[PDB]
């Protein structure tokens, strides 16, 4: 890194700074007087203070990026959000007043819930005991669960089974499927858990 260890990461949060002094605790008061003496890294070009900033979508976009082509990866993401929203407006106008109440039209809410329905609680990791590697069903940390839900979704859309379908149409179709606890990616979650249940006897390795 070209930053010396002395450089601290920037905190990009308008609210954190407008917070009144009285509400602050003696611990939070010390952190604020300390940072005035610290070196701060330059804010990355990725994240800004914009009210429309979503760290999850920004992360999903980077996991779709091929060869540093952020423009294309970003274009695919926004095309997916537009495709999800249009599919819901078409389902909304074609529905009855009763069904309309249950139809979600926000693509950010669908995107987040679609991934949360794919996060695997438990995974298989080879813990070694006795000179052999046994795929032990191990709990998964929160970081790993969120990452696996993204990698599985991106991998499924890159599968060759889809013939000539553009990514914004594939991904939108998979997100709405997973949003309803349906799809191949949801099956991958279920099968991973079922495999982890068949190896419960191997938890001692």
């Amino acid at each position: 890194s070209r930053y010396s260890p002395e450089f601290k990461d920037p905190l990009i949060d308008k609210e954190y700074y407008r917070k009144p002094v009285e509400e602050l605790t003696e611990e939070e008061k010390y952190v604020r007087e300390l940072k005035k003496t610290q070196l701060i890294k330059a804010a990355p070009a990725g994240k800004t203070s914009s009210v429309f900033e979503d760290p999850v979508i920004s992360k999903f976009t980077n996991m779709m990026m091929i060869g540093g082509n952020k423009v294309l990866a970003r274009s695919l993401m926004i095309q997916t959000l537009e495709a999800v929203k249009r599919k819901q407006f078409e389902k909304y106008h074609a529905a009855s007043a009763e069904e309309q109440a249950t139809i979600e039209r926000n693509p950010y809410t669908i995107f987040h819930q679609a991934l949360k329905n794919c996060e695997p609680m438990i995974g298989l990791v080879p813990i070694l005991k006795g000179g052999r590697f046994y795929q032990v069903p191990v709990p998964l940390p929160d970081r790993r669960r969120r990452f696996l839900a993204m990698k599985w979704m991106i991998t499924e859309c890159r599968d060759k089974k889809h013939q000539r379908t553009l990514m914004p149409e594939k991904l939108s179709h998979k997100l709405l499927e997973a949003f309803h606890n349906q799809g191949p990616v949801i099956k991958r979650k279920h099968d991973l858990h079922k495999m982890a249940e068949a190896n419960r006897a191997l938890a001692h390795y």
């Binding site: 609680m121 438990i122 069903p137 949801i186 099956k187 979650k189 279920h190 099968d191 858990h193 079922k194 982890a196 249940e197 419960r200």
Partner: peptide, 10 residues
């Protein structure tokens, strides 16, 4: 393991 969702069993 008990909390986890194993999907519609079959």
């Amino acid at each position: 393991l008990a909390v986890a969702d194993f999907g519609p069993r079959d």
